[PDB]
Amino acid sequence: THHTSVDYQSNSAIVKNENSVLNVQFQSKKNSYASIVFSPEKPWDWSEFNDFNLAFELANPGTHSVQIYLDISDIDGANYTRSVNVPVGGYNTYYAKLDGHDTSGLRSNPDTWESDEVQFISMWGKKNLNLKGIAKIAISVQSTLHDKELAIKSISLRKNPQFNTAFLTKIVDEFGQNAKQEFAGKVHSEAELLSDKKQEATQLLSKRPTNRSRFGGWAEGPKLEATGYFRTAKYNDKWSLVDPDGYLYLATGIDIIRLANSTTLTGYDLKSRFVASQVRKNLFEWLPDYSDTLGKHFGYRKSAHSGPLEHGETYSFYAANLERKYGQNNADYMQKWREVTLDRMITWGFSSLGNWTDPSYYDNQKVPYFANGWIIGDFKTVSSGNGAMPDVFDPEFTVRANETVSVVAKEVKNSPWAVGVFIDNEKSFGRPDSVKSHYGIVINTLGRDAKTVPTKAEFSRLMKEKYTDVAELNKVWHLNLASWAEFDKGVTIDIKNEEQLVDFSILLTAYADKYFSVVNAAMDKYLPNHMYLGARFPDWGMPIEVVKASAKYVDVISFNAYKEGLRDDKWAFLSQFDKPAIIGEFHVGSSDSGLFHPGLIHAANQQDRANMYTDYMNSVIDNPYFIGAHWFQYIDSPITGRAYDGENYNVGFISVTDRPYIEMIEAAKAMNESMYERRFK
């Protein structure tokens, strides 16, 4: 229907008409965004159809798999983003449901009918689009390290096949696996678990090899000063860490070495137990009684979002498999899991345990670890206009900051094994997408009472410093304020004024400076010998003012970047600070895991997954500012979604049945082996 002829344009992509087939060469090596956009004469009207799907006949004659983004926009202005991986090879059909069929508490659901076809993964945006007027349909590739290609043979709208009413019925086995689907590494019997443990014990290393120091550093590199703690240095023209014995060190590893995130909502909410959600309940074949052995794995989630529950009861199939696998005959399965986990990292060559490692691990003297704290309190707050952020100028913020960091110190006990502390994570500092996005904190704060809003009170001060008289501001901001007292009370800014931006930038820096000074001070008080690794900025939300402010205080600037790699264009700005950086989170996933959601970055298969992993880690290693990266996370998200937000991604280095993804492991081992020599030699 839509193509077999339709008008289109391209953005950093050569399009050739070879037969009926659009060959798209995405110029994605050079350009961080590349696309072919399908725009008709008059905005498509699909009012006349119901219960239907948009289908693409896609091949990939390239030499890398392509994660394509499907963007469908309105005459109305709303947009929804979908994504899928197109493997190197011939044609498959990719479809997206636009109306009907599918609430379940899963970020991505099973298909609503059986096929050999591939459904796009729903990512973000406004789902319920305006079918009456569809402006554009864009296929884009974003933030790759390689040119990508796509062959489009046909685009069409199709009537959805017959609904499967049991698509959410017993999709989980008693092991937490995809019940209805076979997949690589699927456990069929409990005896497989016991058999795994025995086999794995054979291959597991105990100690670091002789080409690694005891702290996991470069035993054959230079020998810098031994401070007895992890620290930063420059060797040649590249940033490095230094281990406590003065060997060079780069941070590789895995986050969430803990069970806190491996639980899923059962649908129940002890003598007052009730089914709060029938749909949740029916997902799983097996859920034990509280009097059962494996009933030990029942938890409760106070707060839950994006699902048919705001609270309720949880179960952890991974923790259950741990008991099954390591807790034979009353054995301390937790302790055994920790010992296996430590050995795995040695064996895989990981130099550290990542963020959100369980305090259980902190007194270990085998593998280094990263510690963390969240700053929570009843202190006053500001808003990015949309996320609630700390009023960093409230004295109550320093009070809680100190207690937060103090807590961590007691966990760490001044151990050289602690590489450093993360404080907070992806705070809502603002997104530099527009004025409103960039300076939401400033804009929202400026219309609040200086008398009651400490952050605003500092804004007042700084602006008095620069402007002296309020009439002189009235010029630049193009406003008609009466007095510094009215300003102090609250100002509604002119969204379109450009001259005030220079000031907004002062105010955002000022807010950020206080944030990072407070936390830096707290670290000085409680863990003075340890590095402070920042606040883990998301690459989608890292205003330059916030980064700049952090550079004065942190030992290492942390970012999370869920991309195919660290592109030169994207990270060039780091050269203005000359500071070392770490990636707190990254991952690749694939649907061949039997999960319903590959995650944020998509590969063709486990082997592609590992190869893309290698490409990302190579980009980290070859970047002169970056000193490491941590994989998110250790364990696959539960197939029915983690209890907090329904996230059900293939993010695990191991599956729910405590089986390492083999291909990932071998990429990991390779990468860790050659990392020091690649960077420095």
Added chain:
Amino acid sequence: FADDTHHTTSVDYQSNSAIVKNENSVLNVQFQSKKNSYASIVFSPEKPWDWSEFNDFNLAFELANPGTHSVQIYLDISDIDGANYTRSVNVPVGGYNTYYAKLDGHDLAFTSGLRSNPDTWESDEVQFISMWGKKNLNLKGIAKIAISVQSTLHDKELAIKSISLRKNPQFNTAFLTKIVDEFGQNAKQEFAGKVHSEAELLSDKKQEATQLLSKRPTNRSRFGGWAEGPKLEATGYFRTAKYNDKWSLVDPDGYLYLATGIDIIRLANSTTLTGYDFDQALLANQVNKEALKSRFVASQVRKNLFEWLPDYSDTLGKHFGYRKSAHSGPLEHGETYSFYAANLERKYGQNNADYMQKWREVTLDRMITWGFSSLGNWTDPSYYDNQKVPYFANGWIIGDFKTVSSGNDFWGAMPDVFDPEFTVRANETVSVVAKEVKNSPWAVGVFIDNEKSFGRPDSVKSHYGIVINTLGRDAKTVPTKAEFSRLMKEKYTDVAELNKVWHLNLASWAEFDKGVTIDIKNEEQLVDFSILLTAYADKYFSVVNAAMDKYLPNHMYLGARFPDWGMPIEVVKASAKYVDVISFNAYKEGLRDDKWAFLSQFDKPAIIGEFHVGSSDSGLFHPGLIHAANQQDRANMYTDYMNSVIDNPYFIGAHWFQYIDSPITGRAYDGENYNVGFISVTDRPYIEMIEAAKAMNESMYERRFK
């Protein structure tokens, strides 16, 4: 561009070990290929298709695969005359693609010297690989189109959306023009692992060096055996034994041992015809000074394949050679070049370093690192003195002894093994091997000869050809016939009794001795045919065994590498009485139980001499004999094949053919241009293959014996 639909339109079909259901308008075919070594769907009309009226056209199939494994289909088209031709292609798991076979026009109308040519037009479709048969079929009468699945380990599936005849697109006249780059790579196509600059070679070497091991891991014995397994009598030589009700080898130190590794660890088969030649009279392996002066273009088509050849004065000019005997191409002889050897000197020969010695060293280390227990057949004798990786040795028995024939010229000549000169030449061959091996414990064993034309057990004529043809000859001048006369007289006393059994009217034994034309339809004689064929093979193996007993007494004799398509039971039986290990070549997806059950007759250990899987994503124009969807599938199919070797209680190992990909423009001898390499022409190991090999070799002892 479509001429005519065959299925979209219905046509009559029959199935064979295959369930076909017409779900919607598609034929979904479930080949029952796990249980049945041949499964098929056969499309046949009431009257033979007449396609005479078409020219410059192709036959096209729109195919998906809803199964869990990729499927190599065989496409056989047969005509009214009983001629047949076989094409093959891999259909990956997934949706619909077009697979086509040109029936007329373009390159068909190879003189290229490539077993399989580049496509004659660029497309989003997949050309079938021409395999074998009578290609020039009668398009007046196409009797049947067969799609089959052959010797798999798994059930395969196929979805057929349409079959059609179509006009060929515009002929790309430049399809054989500059298809090779200076590295011997596919110039026009981008492929995974393609080298773009010489610097990448040096880059490659540095990186691989840090990853190469130079010594066996702790869990492997010095001779590559099972360090943690039982310890048996150490004889100081490789030998056979049983453990846990399964055949094994035993290394010199007494540890259990299975043979894994790769064939053709040498340069001899990495050369391709350049299209140049010389004044034949000036020829006395690079040509001499006087002959070089008469260099001329003998094949324009060959010359134009290449973007670059060096000049003889260039450093890389030393990689020119010469081939005295070539077939299946435009040249019967001519200049060759070795892009692989050129790459070795580029990679390892900087600053006049000993590039060959370094290649040998990296090769040994690669085998260690990849976990292979051995170097396979046709290892360059350069390696024989190595004390790091065990190796298989070989000889060919060649000479001017008398010969016998199958009665089919394409099958080839066979030694008259009752000719005393055959024994002289056997002895002399084995003696040469003995001087190369120098009694080294590192030599696992000796293969003598390879895929001799003993017969194919699929028709009486094919099976007993040597017997039939020899019976027709004179005892006076044909030793094998003199032996056949002896055995029949021993059995029948009087000719009259044989005349009865064979349904003949021979006047005298003197007639029999002079020459008999047997009755091809007579069945009673087949017991005698079996006796005669056994007797032939028995003397063959007895002679070789006695040679081995003289010169290499301490070392295993590994037989003569029978092809799985041509292994008469009589010959296998004869061999079992002499060899330490029975060797076979088997280019299939695996060792099927049904194919190899016969081994229980002899309770001997067996070895696979050669097997391979190839894929088109290597950038070569021919995936080979067994086809995968891509490099990853290729590795997975490798793994399955090796699992079937490891799981088989008679087999003690298998060798992969071969180390290096064949030249993209054909090996000089016969134009074979397959993706058979563990490594590419630029000395880059195929990463997926290496990873699968490492895992396989790691687990083999445990999997087989624990």
